[PDB]
């Protein structure tokens, strides 16, 4: 009674956890929107710069390229609260994972991979590196707006421009950087504290595709001591795992993909066509059909 960002959108029930995600309603169009808030007194915030990365994809209210959530408004709530109003989406691949008993079929993974390699290619074309690959950040569209067969990409607060503003070239190779995203999927180089490039997004994607096919990754419940020790035991286990073994199931297409994205150079430009050509070939060599029929396209 009554939380309000911009005389238009009325906030609703809290639908997300330290940043708070909330439901909203466009009182003009009766749309249902997603509202991401941030306490004004936040040590090292990131809501504003996430909005900035969204503008570069543009992604500006009406436009929004496919797979990108529309951005409606950037305002403030109350009351010590900065807010970004964006598009409402459906469940994530991790939600759908648990729905499908934590095991995706080859057909689904291939369909997933096809979309993501496209999705992640567009991000790179807009001079950005994602750096936060995990199943929780890929959401299907709402069934209401016939986009239930579209995988979206969100959460851009941890992204970086790999094209420098001055010099207009690729960012220089530096090391001893921190340690960003999710240790479950992050690349080998990331563990070593190396600066992330376009190659490191793809390796994490590959790690994730494996997670889908297998059930989990061999560096699973490696739990011990401190957080700095937790990341180490995971990273030290990734470098001691042959790709011929990680994909032991399992078409060689996932083995050659992983070798490609790992042996890439920091500055080198990936062949997205070729990577998509490997999965599409295997797809049709199995005789699959692309109607939008995922494993979950009936379940909750």
PDB file of C-alpha atoms in Angstrom:
ATOM      1  CA  UNK A   1       0.000   0.000   0.000  1.00  0.00           C
ATOM      2  CA  UNK A   2       1.577   0.775  -2.323  1.00  0.00           C
ATOM      3  CA  UNK A   3       5.121   0.106  -3.587  1.00  0.00           C
ATOM      4  CA  UNK A   4       5.551   2.047  -6.826  1.00  0.00           C
ATOM      5  CA  UNK A   5       8.379   2.566  -9.329  1.00  0.00           C
ATOM      6  CA  UNK A   6       7.471   5.167 -11.958  1.00  0.00           C
ATOM      7  CA  UNK A   7       3.763   6.172 -11.993  1.00  0.00           C
ATOM      8  CA  UNK A   8       2.996   3.006 -13.966  1.00  0.00           C
ATOM      9  CA  UNK A   9       4.448  -0.151 -12.401  1.00  0.00           C
ATOM     10  CA  UNK A  10       3.109  -1.400  -9.064  1.00  0.00           C
ATOM     11  CA  UNK A  11       5.300  -3.838  -7.132  1.00  0.00           C
ATOM     12  CA  UNK A  12       3.907  -7.157  -5.891  1.00  0.00           C
ATOM     13  CA  UNK A  13       5.017 -10.228  -3.944  1.00  0.00           C
ATOM     14  CA  UNK A  14       8.722 -10.827  -3.353  1.00  0.00           C
ATOM     15  CA  UNK A  15       9.679 -13.555  -5.810  1.00  0.00           C
ATOM     16  CA  UNK A  16      13.457 -13.522  -5.367  1.00  0.00           C
ATOM     17  CA  UNK A  17      15.820 -13.856  -2.401  1.00  0.00           C
ATOM     18  CA  UNK A  18      20.243 -10.166  -0.991  1.00  0.00           C
ATOM     19  CA  UNK A  19      19.005  -8.215  -4.004  1.00  0.00           C
ATOM     20  CA  UNK A  20      15.283  -9.071  -3.984  1.00  0.00           C
ATOM     21  CA  UNK A  21      13.319  -9.937  -7.123  1.00  0.00           C
ATOM     22  CA  UNK A  22       9.672  -8.859  -7.133  1.00  0.00           C
ATOM     23  CA  UNK A  23       6.535  -9.218  -9.247  1.00  0.00           C
ATOM     24  CA  UNK A  24       4.974  -6.125 -10.802  1.00  0.00           C
ATOM     25  CA  UNK A  25       2.010  -4.960 -12.859  1.00  0.00           C
ATOM     26  CA  UNK A  26       1.941  -2.398 -15.666  1.00  0.00           C
ATOM     27  CA  UNK A  27      -1.165  -0.412 -14.726  1.00  0.00           C
ATOM     28  CA  UNK A  28      -1.264   0.931 -18.297  1.00  0.00           C
ATOM     29  CA  UNK A  29      -1.096  -2.321 -20.263  1.00  0.00           C
ATOM     30  CA  UNK A  30      -1.946  -4.833 -17.518  1.00  0.00           C
ATOM     31  CA  UNK A  31       1.369  -6.506 -18.299  1.00  0.00           C
ATOM     32  CA  UNK A  32       3.131  -8.556 -15.648  1.00  0.00           C
ATOM     33  CA  UNK A  33       6.712  -7.366 -15.195  1.00  0.00           C
ATOM     34  CA  UNK A  34       9.846  -8.334 -13.278  1.00  0.00           C
ATOM     35  CA  UNK A  35      11.381  -5.819 -10.872  1.00  0.00           C
ATOM     36  CA  UNK A  36      14.981  -6.085  -9.646  1.00  0.00           C
ATOM     37  CA  UNK A  37      15.766  -3.830  -6.683  1.00  0.00           C
ATOM     38  CA  UNK A  38      18.941  -2.640  -4.942  1.00  0.00           C
ATOM     39  CA  UNK A  39      19.544  -0.910  -1.592  1.00  0.00           C
ATOM     40  CA  UNK A  40      20.978   2.552  -2.290  1.00  0.00           C
ATOM     41  CA  UNK A  41      23.507   2.009   0.492  1.00  0.00           C
ATOM     42  CA  UNK A  42      25.219  -0.934  -1.196  1.00  0.00           C
ATOM     43  CA  UNK A  43      28.968  -1.494  -0.931  1.00  0.00           C
ATOM     44  CA  UNK A  44      30.037  -2.047  -4.549  1.00  0.00           C
ATOM     45  CA  UNK A  45      26.621  -2.146  -6.306  1.00  0.00           C
ATOM     46  CA  UNK A  46      25.954  -3.420  -9.842  1.00  0.00           C
ATOM     47  CA  UNK A  47      22.306  -2.830 -10.791  1.00  0.00           C
ATOM     48  CA  UNK A  48      23.041   0.336 -12.767  1.00  0.00           C
ATOM     49  CA  UNK A  49      25.908  -1.194 -14.754  1.00  0.00           C
ATOM     50  CA  UNK A  50      23.799  -4.277 -15.484  1.00  0.00           C
ATOM     51  CA  UNK A  51      21.266  -1.934 -17.064  1.00  0.00           C
ATOM     52  CA  UNK A  52      24.128  -0.370 -19.026  1.00  0.00           C
ATOM     53  CA  UNK A  53      25.114  -3.742 -20.486  1.00  0.00           C
ATOM     54  CA  UNK A  54      21.467  -4.287 -21.426  1.00  0.00           C
ATOM     55  CA  UNK A  55      21.428  -1.056 -23.438  1.00  0.00           C
ATOM     56  CA  UNK A  56      24.445  -2.211 -25.463  1.00  0.00           C
ATOM     57  CA  UNK A  57      22.442  -5.269 -26.492  1.00  0.00           C
ATOM     58  CA  UNK A  58      19.411  -3.017 -27.024  1.00  0.00           C
ATOM     59  CA  UNK A  59      17.019  -4.383 -25.766  1.00  0.00           C
ATOM     60  CA  UNK A  60      15.189  -1.092 -25.252  1.00  0.00           C
ATOM     61  CA  UNK A  61      11.549  -1.611 -24.194  1.00  0.00           C
ATOM     62  CA  UNK A  62      10.063  -2.578 -27.572  1.00  0.00           C
ATOM     63  CA  UNK A  63      12.991  -3.957 -29.584  1.00  0.00           C
ATOM     64  CA  UNK A  64      14.980  -6.636 -27.742  1.00  0.00           C
ATOM     65  CA  UNK A  65      16.599  -9.221 -30.033  1.00  0.00           C
ATOM     66  CA  UNK A  66      15.273 -12.766 -29.590  1.00  0.00           C
ATOM     67  CA  UNK A  67      16.539 -14.415 -26.418  1.00  0.00           C
ATOM     68  CA  UNK A  68      17.034 -11.043 -24.742  1.00  0.00           C
ATOM     69  CA  UNK A  69      14.582  -9.763 -22.109  1.00  0.00           C
ATOM     70  CA  UNK A  70      13.030  -6.360 -22.817  1.00  0.00           C
ATOM     71  CA  UNK A  71      14.018  -3.560 -20.443  1.00  0.00           C
ATOM     72  CA  UNK A  72      11.101  -1.331 -19.485  1.00  0.00           C
ATOM     73  CA  UNK A  73      12.311   1.222 -16.920  1.00  0.00           C
ATOM     74  CA  UNK A  74      15.168   2.300 -14.639  1.00  0.00           C
ATOM     75  CA  UNK A  75      13.939   4.201 -11.591  1.00  0.00           C
ATOM     76  CA  UNK A  76      13.851   4.248  -7.796  1.00  0.00           C
ATOM     77  CA  UNK A  77      11.566   2.897  -5.061  1.00  0.00           C
ATOM     78  CA  UNK A  78      10.588   4.685  -1.845  1.00  0.00           C
ATOM     79  CA  UNK A  79      12.385   4.691   0.273  1.00  0.00           C
ATOM     80  CA  UNK A  80      16.055   3.848  -0.314  1.00  0.00           C
ATOM     81  CA  UNK A  81      15.700   1.496  -3.299  1.00  0.00           C
ATOM     82  CA  UNK A  82      17.023   1.539  -6.873  1.00  0.00           C
ATOM     83  CA  UNK A  83      15.000  -0.563  -9.307  1.00  0.00           C
ATOM     84  CA  UNK A  84      15.222  -2.048 -12.801  1.00  0.00           C
ATOM     85  CA  UNK A  85      11.963  -3.168 -14.427  1.00  0.00           C
ATOM     86  CA  UNK A  86      12.392  -5.875 -17.064  1.00  0.00           C
ATOM     87  CA  UNK A  87      10.525  -8.685 -18.825  1.00  0.00           C
ATOM     88  CA  UNK A  88       8.958 -11.608 -16.951  1.00  0.00           C
ATOM     89  CA  UNK A  89      10.213 -15.056 -17.966  1.00  0.00           C
ATOM     90  CA  UNK A  90       9.415 -18.676 -17.131  1.00  0.00           C
ATOM     91  CA  UNK A  91      11.484 -21.378 -15.443  1.00  0.00           C
ATOM     92  CA  UNK A  92      15.256 -21.798 -15.715  1.00  0.00           C
ATOM     93  CA  UNK A  93      17.202 -24.744 -17.121  1.00  0.00           C
ATOM     94  CA  UNK A  94      18.011 -25.744 -13.537  1.00  0.00           C
ATOM     95  CA  UNK A  95      14.314 -25.677 -12.664  1.00  0.00           C
ATOM     96  CA  UNK A  96      13.543 -27.719 -15.779  1.00  0.00           C
ATOM     97  CA  UNK A  97      16.514 -29.943 -14.911  1.00  0.00           C
ATOM     98  CA  UNK A  98      15.035 -30.965 -11.564  1.00  0.00           C
ATOM     99  CA  UNK A  99      11.665 -31.333 -13.292  1.00  0.00           C
ATOM    100  CA  UNK A 100      13.219 -33.847 -15.702  1.00  0.00           C
ATOM    101  CA  UNK A 101      14.799 -35.832 -12.838  1.00  0.00           C
ATOM    102  CA  UNK A 102      18.208 -34.178 -13.351  1.00  0.00           C
ATOM    103  CA  UNK A 103      18.954 -35.807 -16.712  1.00  0.00           C
ATOM    104  CA  UNK A 104      18.410 -34.272 -20.150  1.00  0.00           C
ATOM    105  CA  UNK A 105      18.276 -36.376 -23.304  1.00  0.00           C
ATOM    106  CA  UNK A 106      20.800 -35.858 -26.094  1.00  0.00           C
ATOM    107  CA  UNK A 107      18.072 -34.341 -28.276  1.00  0.00           C
ATOM    108  CA  UNK A 108      17.311 -31.667 -25.685  1.00  0.00           C
ATOM    109  CA  UNK A 109      20.947 -30.839 -24.917  1.00  0.00           C
ATOM    110  CA  UNK A 110      21.564 -30.449 -28.658  1.00  0.00           C
ATOM    111  CA  UNK A 111      18.529 -28.165 -28.930  1.00  0.00           C
ATOM    112  CA  UNK A 112      19.801 -26.232 -25.916  1.00  0.00           C
ATOM    113  CA  UNK A 113      23.339 -26.020 -27.296  1.00  0.00           C
ATOM    114  CA  UNK A 114      22.054 -24.731 -30.643  1.00  0.00           C
ATOM    115  CA  UNK A 115      20.236 -21.805 -29.036  1.00  0.00           C
ATOM    116  CA  UNK A 116      22.977 -20.923 -26.549  1.00  0.00           C
ATOM    117  CA  UNK A 117      25.779 -20.913 -29.133  1.00  0.00           C
ATOM    118  CA  UNK A 118      23.619 -18.464 -31.054  1.00  0.00           C
ATOM    119  CA  UNK A 119      22.719 -16.507 -27.925  1.00  0.00           C
ATOM    120  CA  UNK A 120      26.302 -16.305 -26.666  1.00  0.00           C
ATOM    121  CA  UNK A 121      27.507 -15.335 -30.157  1.00  0.00           C
ATOM    122  CA  UNK A 122      25.297 -12.246 -30.155  1.00  0.00           C
ATOM    123  CA  UNK A 123      26.635 -11.198 -26.752  1.00  0.00           C
ATOM    124  CA  UNK A 124      30.192 -11.369 -28.069  1.00  0.00           C
ATOM    125  CA  UNK A 125      29.180  -9.481 -31.219  1.00  0.00           C
ATOM    126  CA  UNK A 126      28.100  -6.627 -28.950  1.00  0.00           C
ATOM    127  CA  UNK A 127      31.647  -6.587 -27.546  1.00  0.00           C
ATOM    128  CA  UNK A 128      30.841  -8.316 -24.248  1.00  0.00           C
ATOM    129  CA  UNK A 129      32.050 -11.351 -22.329  1.00  0.00           C
ATOM    130  CA  UNK A 130      29.424 -12.974 -20.102  1.00  0.00           C
ATOM    131  CA  UNK A 131      31.529 -14.552 -17.315  1.00  0.00           C
ATOM    132  CA  UNK A 132      28.567 -15.988 -15.358  1.00  0.00           C
ATOM    133  CA  UNK A 133      27.574 -19.292 -16.952  1.00  0.00           C
ATOM    134  CA  UNK A 134      25.238 -21.484 -14.912  1.00  0.00           C
ATOM    135  CA  UNK A 135      21.909 -23.244 -15.654  1.00  0.00           C
ATOM    136  CA  UNK A 136      20.128 -20.835 -13.290  1.00  0.00           C
ATOM    137  CA  UNK A 137      20.642 -17.961 -15.747  1.00  0.00           C
ATOM    138  CA  UNK A 138      18.894 -19.470 -18.773  1.00  0.00           C
ATOM    139  CA  UNK A 139      15.112 -19.123 -18.732  1.00  0.00           C
ATOM    140  CA  UNK A 140      12.339 -20.291 -21.050  1.00  0.00           C
ATOM    141  CA  UNK A 141       9.687 -17.776 -22.069  1.00  0.00           C
ATOM    142  CA  UNK A 142       6.256 -17.680 -20.441  1.00  0.00           C
ATOM    143  CA  UNK A 143       3.696 -20.043 -21.977  1.00  0.00           C
ATOM    144  CA  UNK A 144       1.223 -17.155 -22.238  1.00  0.00           C
ATOM    145  CA  UNK A 145       3.352 -15.270 -24.757  1.00  0.00           C
ATOM    146  CA  UNK A 146       4.122 -18.109 -27.198  1.00  0.00           C
ATOM    147  CA  UNK A 147       7.844 -18.170 -26.413  1.00  0.00           C
ATOM    148  CA  UNK A 148       7.959 -21.312 -24.283  1.00  0.00           C
ATOM    149  CA  UNK A 149      10.375 -22.776 -26.835  1.00  0.00           C
ATOM    150  CA  UNK A 150      12.927 -19.969 -26.450  1.00  0.00           C
ATOM    151  CA  UNK A 151      15.952 -20.051 -24.145  1.00  0.00           C
ATOM    152  CA  UNK A 152      16.781 -16.594 -22.778  1.00  0.00           C
ATOM    153  CA  UNK A 153      19.954 -15.240 -21.182  1.00  0.00           C
ATOM    154  CA  UNK A 154      19.945 -12.982 -18.102  1.00  0.00           C
ATOM    155  CA  UNK A 155      22.071 -11.663 -15.209  1.00  0.00           C
ATOM    156  CA  UNK A 156      24.639  -9.369 -16.820  1.00  0.00           C
ATOM    157  CA  UNK A 157      26.050  -7.723 -13.697  1.00  0.00           C
ATOM    158  CA  UNK A 158      29.317  -9.646 -13.933  1.00  0.00           C
ATOM    159  CA  UNK A 159      30.056  -8.912 -17.593  1.00  0.00           C
ATOM    160  CA  UNK A 160      33.032  -7.049 -19.043  1.00  0.00           C
ATOM    161  CA  UNK A 161      33.742  -5.267 -22.319  1.00  0.00           C
ATOM    162  CA  UNK A 162      36.586  -7.077 -24.069  1.00  0.00           C
ATOM    163  CA  UNK A 163      36.977  -4.245 -26.569  1.00  0.00           C
ATOM    164  CA  UNK A 164      38.806  -1.291 -25.019  1.00  0.00           C
ATOM    165  CA  UNK A 165      37.322   2.210 -25.320  1.00  0.00           C
ATOM    166  CA  UNK A 166      40.734   3.739 -25.964  1.00  0.00           C
ATOM    167  CA  UNK A 167      43.039   2.065 -28.541  1.00  0.00           C
ATOM    168  CA  UNK A 168      39.871   0.281 -29.770  1.00  0.00           C
ATOM    169  CA  UNK A 169      41.539  -3.131 -29.460  1.00  0.00           C
ATOM    170  CA  UNK A 170      41.175  -6.352 -27.470  1.00  0.00           C
ATOM    171  CA  UNK A 171      41.803  -5.986 -23.732  1.00  0.00           C
ATOM    172  CA  UNK A 172      45.397  -6.824 -22.732  1.00  0.00           C
ATOM    173  CA  UNK A 173      46.166 -10.181 -21.131  1.00  0.00           C
ATOM    174  CA  UNK A 174      46.558  -9.720 -17.385  1.00  0.00           C
ATOM    175  CA  UNK A 175      46.665 -12.294 -14.604  1.00  0.00           C
ATOM    176  CA  UNK A 176      46.242 -12.567 -10.836  1.00  0.00           C
ATOM    177  CA  UNK A 177      42.642 -11.449 -11.295  1.00  0.00           C
ATOM    178  CA  UNK A 178      40.133 -12.360  -8.566  1.00  0.00           C
ATOM    179  CA  UNK A 179      37.791 -15.325  -9.185  1.00  0.00           C
ATOM    180  CA  UNK A 180      34.287 -14.540 -10.392  1.00  0.00           C
ATOM    181  CA  UNK A 181      31.460 -16.904 -11.337  1.00  0.00           C
ATOM    182  CA  UNK A 182      30.351 -20.392 -10.386  1.00  0.00           C
ATOM    183  CA  UNK A 183      33.126 -22.893  -9.676  1.00  0.00           C
ATOM    184  CA  UNK A 184      31.015 -25.798 -10.902  1.00  0.00           C
ATOM    185  CA  UNK A 185      31.208 -24.646 -14.532  1.00  0.00           C
ATOM    186  CA  UNK A 186      33.978 -22.024 -14.744  1.00  0.00           C
ATOM    187  CA  UNK A 187      36.868 -22.596 -17.154  1.00  0.00           C
ATOM    188  CA  UNK A 188      40.278 -24.021 -16.256  1.00  0.00           C
ATOM    189  CA  UNK A 189      41.978 -20.692 -16.980  1.00  0.00           C
ATOM    190  CA  UNK A 190      39.588 -18.867 -14.649  1.00  0.00           C
ATOM    191  CA  UNK A 191      40.771 -21.028 -11.742  1.00  0.00           C
ATOM    192  CA  UNK A 192      44.354 -19.998 -12.488  1.00  0.00           C
ATOM    193  CA  UNK A 193      43.279 -16.380 -12.033  1.00  0.00           C
ATOM    194  CA  UNK A 194      43.646 -15.552 -15.714  1.00  0.00           C
ATOM    195  CA  UNK A 195      41.568 -12.822 -17.368  1.00  0.00           C
ATOM    196  CA  UNK A 196      38.506 -14.289 -19.084  1.00  0.00           C
ATOM    197  CA  UNK A 197      37.971 -14.078 -22.841  1.00  0.00           C
ATOM    198  CA  UNK A 198      35.370 -15.353 -25.301  1.00  0.00           C
ATOM    199  CA  UNK A 199      37.013 -18.781 -25.080  1.00  0.00           C
ATOM    200  CA  UNK A 200      36.189 -19.059 -21.375  1.00  0.00           C
ATOM    201  CA  UNK A 201      32.444 -18.605 -21.859  1.00  0.00           C
ATOM    202  CA  UNK A 202      32.371 -21.496 -24.322  1.00  0.00           C
ATOM    203  CA  UNK A 203      34.299 -23.823 -22.020  1.00  0.00           C
ATOM    204  CA  UNK A 204      31.782 -23.171 -19.245  1.00  0.00           C
ATOM    205  CA  UNK A 205      28.961 -23.831 -21.717  1.00  0.00           C
ATOM    206  CA  UNK A 206      30.658 -27.115 -22.577  1.00  0.00           C
ATOM    207  CA  UNK A 207      30.998 -27.908 -18.883  1.00  0.00           C
ATOM    208  CA  UNK A 208      27.275 -27.255 -18.549  1.00  0.00           C
ATOM    209  CA  UNK A 209      26.271 -29.389 -21.547  1.00  0.00           C
ATOM    210  CA  UNK A 210      28.188 -32.179 -19.861  1.00  0.00           C
ATOM    211  CA  UNK A 211      26.324 -31.554 -16.598  1.00  0.00           C
ATOM    212  CA  UNK A 212      23.085 -32.012 -18.555  1.00  0.00           C
ATOM    213  CA  UNK A 213      24.055 -35.300 -20.214  1.00  0.00           C
ATOM    214  CA  UNK A 214      25.890 -36.901 -17.284  1.00  0.00           C
ATOM    215  CA  UNK A 215      23.960 -35.989 -14.137  1.00  0.00           C
ATOM    216  CA  UNK A 216      26.706 -34.030 -12.432  1.00  0.00           C
ATOM    217  CA  UNK A 217      30.415 -33.331 -12.876  1.00  0.00           C
ATOM    218  CA  UNK A 218      33.196 -35.461 -11.262  1.00  0.00           C
ATOM    219  CA  UNK A 219      34.258 -32.377  -9.292  1.00  0.00           C
ATOM    220  CA  UNK A 220      30.911 -32.527  -7.484  1.00  0.00           C
ATOM    221  CA  UNK A 221      30.849 -32.797  -3.693  1.00  0.00           C
ATOM    222  CA  UNK A 222      34.486 -31.795  -3.345  1.00  0.00           C
ATOM    223  CA  UNK A 223      33.739 -30.000  -0.080  1.00  0.00           C
ATOM    224  CA  UNK A 224      36.500 -28.904   2.295  1.00  0.00           C
ATOM    225  CA  UNK A 225      37.852 -26.095   4.493  1.00  0.00           C
ATOM    226  CA  UNK A 226      37.918 -22.509   3.224  1.00  0.00           C
ATOM    227  CA  UNK A 227      36.400 -20.950   0.107  1.00  0.00           C
ATOM    228  CA  UNK A 228      39.863 -20.369  -1.353  1.00  0.00           C
ATOM    229  CA  UNK A 229      40.524 -24.057  -0.711  1.00  0.00           C
ATOM    230  CA  UNK A 230      37.136 -25.019  -2.149  1.00  0.00           C
ATOM    231  CA  UNK A 231      37.868 -23.345  -5.491  1.00  0.00           C
ATOM    232  CA  UNK A 232      41.332 -24.920  -5.596  1.00  0.00           C
ATOM    233  CA  UNK A 233      40.226 -28.544  -5.188  1.00  0.00           C
ATOM    234  CA  UNK A 234      37.638 -28.022  -7.924  1.00  0.00           C
ATOM    235  CA  UNK A 235      40.081 -26.357 -10.308  1.00  0.00           C
ATOM    236  CA  UNK A 236      42.847 -28.859  -9.594  1.00  0.00           C
ATOM    237  CA  UNK A 237      40.398 -31.634 -10.463  1.00  0.00           C
ATOM    238  CA  UNK A 238      39.387 -30.101 -13.797  1.00  0.00           C
ATOM    239  CA  UNK A 239      42.980 -30.152 -15.065  1.00  0.00           C
ATOM    240  CA  UNK A 240      43.295 -33.816 -14.093  1.00  0.00           C
ATOM    241  CA  UNK A 241      40.333 -35.056 -16.131  1.00  0.00           C
ATOM    242  CA  UNK A 242      40.695 -36.291 -19.738  1.00  0.00           C
ATOM    243  CA  UNK A 243      37.975 -35.154 -22.132  1.00  0.00           C
ATOM    244  CA  UNK A 244      37.895 -38.687 -23.551  1.00  0.00           C
ATOM    245  CA  UNK A 245      36.798 -39.734 -20.057  1.00  0.00           C
ATOM    246  CA  UNK A 246      34.525 -36.814 -19.158  1.00  0.00           C
ATOM    247  CA  UNK A 247      32.476 -37.587 -22.270  1.00  0.00           C
ATOM    248  CA  UNK A 248      32.676 -41.359 -21.766  1.00  0.00           C
ATOM    249  CA  UNK A 249      28.991 -41.878 -22.615  1.00  0.00           C
ATOM    250  CA  UNK A 250      28.704 -40.094 -25.267  1.00  0.00           C
ATOM    251  CA  UNK A 251      29.304 -38.718 -28.806  1.00  0.00           C
ATOM    252  CA  UNK A 252      32.845 -37.568 -29.645  1.00  0.00           C
ATOM    253  CA  UNK A 253      31.264 -34.267 -30.720  1.00  0.00           C
ATOM    254  CA  UNK A 254      31.397 -33.214 -27.071  1.00  0.00           C
ATOM    255  CA  UNK A 255      35.036 -34.272 -26.853  1.00  0.00           C
ATOM    256  CA  UNK A 256      36.210 -32.292 -29.883  1.00  0.00           C
ATOM    257  CA  UNK A 257      34.196 -29.261 -28.764  1.00  0.00           C
ATOM    258  CA  UNK A 258      35.889 -29.200 -25.367  1.00  0.00           C
ATOM    259  CA  UNK A 259      39.359 -29.566 -26.897  1.00  0.00           C
ATOM    260  CA  UNK A 260      38.633 -26.707 -29.305  1.00  0.00           C
ATOM    261  CA  UNK A 261      37.472 -24.197 -26.688  1.00  0.00           C
ATOM    262  CA  UNK A 262      40.279 -25.126 -24.286  1.00  0.00           C
ATOM    263  CA  UNK A 263      43.113 -24.949 -26.818  1.00  0.00           C
ATOM    264  CA  UNK A 264      41.890 -21.559 -28.067  1.00  0.00           C
ATOM    265  CA  UNK A 265      43.956 -18.426 -27.499  1.00  0.00           C
ATOM    266  CA  UNK A 266      42.947 -15.472 -25.308  1.00  0.00           C
ATOM    267  CA  UNK A 267      42.726 -13.145 -28.318  1.00  0.00           C
ATOM    268  CA  UNK A 268      41.516 -15.763 -30.812  1.00  0.00           C
ATOM    269  CA  UNK A 269      38.101 -15.563 -32.503  1.00  0.00           C
ATOM    270  CA  UNK A 270      35.937 -18.726 -32.155  1.00  0.00           C
ATOM    271  CA  UNK A 271      34.328 -20.489 -35.117  1.00  0.00           C
ATOM    272  CA  UNK A 272      30.715 -20.486 -33.918  1.00  0.00           C
ATOM    273  CA  UNK A 273      29.515 -21.897 -37.246  1.00  0.00           C
ATOM    274  CA  UNK A 274      31.814 -24.901 -36.889  1.00  0.00           C
ATOM    275  CA  UNK A 275      30.772 -25.559 -33.288  1.00  0.00           C
ATOM    276  CA  UNK A 276      27.111 -25.397 -34.314  1.00  0.00           C
ATOM    277  CA  UNK A 277      27.883 -27.493 -37.388  1.00  0.00           C
ATOM    278  CA  UNK A 278      29.114 -30.342 -35.186  1.00  0.00           C
ATOM    279  CA  UNK A 279      25.925 -30.555 -33.127  1.00  0.00           C
ATOM    280  CA  UNK A 280      23.517 -29.973 -36.024  1.00  0.00           C
ATOM    281  CA  UNK A 281      25.198 -32.798 -37.955  1.00  0.00           C
ATOM    282  CA  UNK A 282      24.933 -35.191 -35.014  1.00  0.00           C
ATOM    283  CA  UNK A 283      21.357 -33.956 -34.572  1.00  0.00           C
ATOM    284  CA  UNK A 284      20.291 -34.970 -38.082  1.00  0.00           C
ATOM    285  CA  UNK A 285      22.486 -38.081 -38.075  1.00  0.00           C
ATOM    286  CA  UNK A 286      20.203 -39.281 -35.282  1.00  0.00           C
ATOM    287  CA  UNK A 287      17.183 -38.191 -37.317  1.00  0.00           C
ATOM    288  CA  UNK A 288      15.763 -35.719 -34.803  1.00  0.00           C
ATOM    289  CA  UNK A 289      13.096 -33.085 -35.471  1.00  0.00           C
ATOM    290  CA  UNK A 290      12.975 -29.470 -34.280  1.00  0.00           C
ATOM    291  CA  UNK A 291       9.363 -28.693 -33.391  1.00  0.00           C
ATOM    292  CA  UNK A 292      10.186 -27.229 -29.987  1.00  0.00           C
ATOM    293  CA  UNK A 293       9.646 -30.573 -28.268  1.00  0.00           C
ATOM    294  CA  UNK A 294      11.985 -30.551 -25.273  1.00  0.00           C
ATOM    295  CA  UNK A 295      11.904 -33.190 -22.527  1.00  0.00           C
ATOM    296  CA  UNK A 296       9.905 -30.785 -20.357  1.00  0.00           C
ATOM    297  CA  UNK A 297       7.386 -29.523 -22.937  1.00  0.00           C
ATOM    298  CA  UNK A 298       4.514 -31.226 -21.118  1.00  0.00           C
ATOM    299  CA  UNK A 299       5.576 -31.245 -17.484  1.00  0.00           C
ATOM    300  CA  UNK A 300       5.034 -28.349 -15.035  1.00  0.00           C
TER     301      UNK A 300
END
